[PDB]
Amino acid sequence: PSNPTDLLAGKFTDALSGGLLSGGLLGILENIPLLDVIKSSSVPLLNNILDIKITDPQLLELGLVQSPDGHRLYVTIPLGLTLNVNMPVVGSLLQLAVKLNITAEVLAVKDNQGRIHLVLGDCTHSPGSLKISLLNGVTPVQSFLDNLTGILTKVLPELIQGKVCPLVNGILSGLDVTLVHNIAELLIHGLQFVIK
Template identity: 70%
Template sequence: MFQIGGLIVFCGLLAQTTALLDTLPLPLDQILLLQGTPVQDLSPTDLAGSLTDALSNGLLSEGLLGVLENLPLLNILNTGGGTSGGLLGGLLGKLTSVLPLLNNIIDIKITNPQLLELGLMQSPEGHRLYVTIPLGITLNVNTPLVGRLLKVAVKLNITAEILSVKNEQGKTHLVLGDCTHSPGSLQISLLNGFAPLPVQSLVNSLTSILTEVLPELVQGKVCPLVNDVLSQLDITLVDSIADLLINGLEFVIKV
């Protein structure tokens, strides 16, 4: 009898406790989860970080580093400014003063391609994103003017505009808008330190041509990769970001 009475009392207390809990409000995160609200909506900073991580990983998966390492710089220099040089031949023809010095270059190898940390900004009206893609390479220049390779560091930013649009079925998705090199972001520096005058003249000539041709060359290779990566992003991430952009809601936190 004692055991049965104790069980009855325990069940009564449990029922009272359950009824009391039912009257208490649920935490906000539990309410949203029960309603099926995506977790990304709870943390805008994490949502922006998820996008940059996905873009960075996607570019690497698409072979970005290999694309940078195989830029046809030596072919461009070997055009000598002739019209047979293709897209950039006419441009080199305008730089006739530097071409004799560039004839002293035997070979250029691109090493150490890098994709640095991506940056993300949201437009003032909140309907578009701007992704900064910082890239770096090292040029190993072989020239008979010196008894060693010249190592030249090059850094350049590509800026990609991301828009949210709706298709005919009313489904939102992210698309690439303008994609170009960031003006003034190109940095070229000699890693070997001080160079004698003939070598410095060669470096200056090389810098002049790289400043003219490299941004457009890199842009033409990288922007199609960005477009490919956007088409392969996780659908949940795309929907969350697209909805925010269409409604002009700020989710990129400015630090």
């Protein structure tokens, strides 16, 4: 397998992605109170929205890049989900496919007792990775309900990142101490291991 550090990236992305699902990521996404965050010239639109249900939450394969000085990792956490908008004037259940990436920077740091840990630094959604598309068959939608997509663009990334970033932090603190130690030693000495 040499060089065995080649495997660390995959192990890290496995443990993190596993941690996310073990920690209830999908249900957490499903239970965001989107229509209430949005409620509490839009009053018409908003008044014609019976409810919103979030279904088919998805975690995609994680991306990982190591910084050029070797001290930091950047994890790309790609998410998908479907918004089910009950809006009767529309004639049908309105479905929106959502995509969003969260970027989490991972750092190594030693504690007051000398123990080394992986910790979350910056954590925030990736500019321009939010995608909201109305599911209408093989024919795309143009200029229908742009206001709804606009409000969603304003609220949805922030809700999602406010749920996902704390979850990532907790997972980091609970990782396998052996994996933590090996990766953190690499990071703290600025040593490259993630293959681009």
